[PDB]
Design a protein around this ligand. Structure first.
Ligand SMILES: COC(=O)[C@@H](Cc1ccccc1)NC(=O)c1cc(C)c(S(=O)(=O)Nc2cc(C(F)(F)F)ccc2Cl)s1
Length: 150
């Protein structure tokens, strides 16, 4: 019964999976699909920029966390709650979180741990929704995300 969680996971999972594999998911979107489609298109544009600009920082974080398997992916939300909460909440920081997700998803594909990508998307979505639900609600959720970056 948690639409914010469901929609956020759908968007984040889609972005991480396509980033890691290079393949678009042809399956139709769930509820509020038009918005989710625009949110995904927005992440492709903004998140690809973030990944280019944040390579150094993202490599630094990946080295320190040393993520190599499902056990490391399952412990990630505890670390990322700390990292993500340690700064001003805005849409930019939220994109950075998801973009770091995509960066880690690409790494997981590289080391033949592609099966960890869905658990990673869950972890990222957990961090976002658990820490920022109230903020996301006030900022009009994914409709707000799309509008902000238009
Ligand atoms: C305000 O929006 C920013 O300025 C974004 C870019 C941006 C600019 C314009 C449009 C969209 C985005 N950038 C940042 O918010 C950040 C960049 C760094 C390097 C940090 S950090 O120092 O806290 N490191 C760190 C933090 C996270 C996160 F997101 F979970 F908090 C994951 C991974 C890393 Cl390595 S936050």
């Amino acid at each position: 019964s948690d639409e914010l969680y469901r929609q956020s996971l759908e968007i984040i999972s889609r972005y991480l999976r396509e980033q890691a594999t290079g393949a678009k998911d042809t399956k139709p979107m769930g509820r509020s699909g038009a918005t989710s489609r625009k949110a995904l298109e927005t992440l492709r544009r903004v998140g690809d920029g973030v990944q280019r600009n944040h390579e150094t920082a993202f490599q630094g974080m990946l080295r320190k966390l040393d993520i190599k398997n499902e056990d490391d992916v399952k412990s990630l939300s505890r670390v990322m709650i700390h990292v993500f909460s340690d700064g001003v909440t805005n849409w930019g920081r939220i994109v950075t979180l998801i973009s770091f997700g995509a960066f880690v998803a690409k790494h997981l594909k590289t080391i033949n741990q592609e099966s960890c990508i869905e658990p990673l998307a869950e972890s990222i979505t957990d961090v976002l929704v658990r820490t920022k639900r109230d903020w996301l609600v006030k900022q009009r959720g994914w409709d707000g995300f799309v509008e902000f970056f238009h």
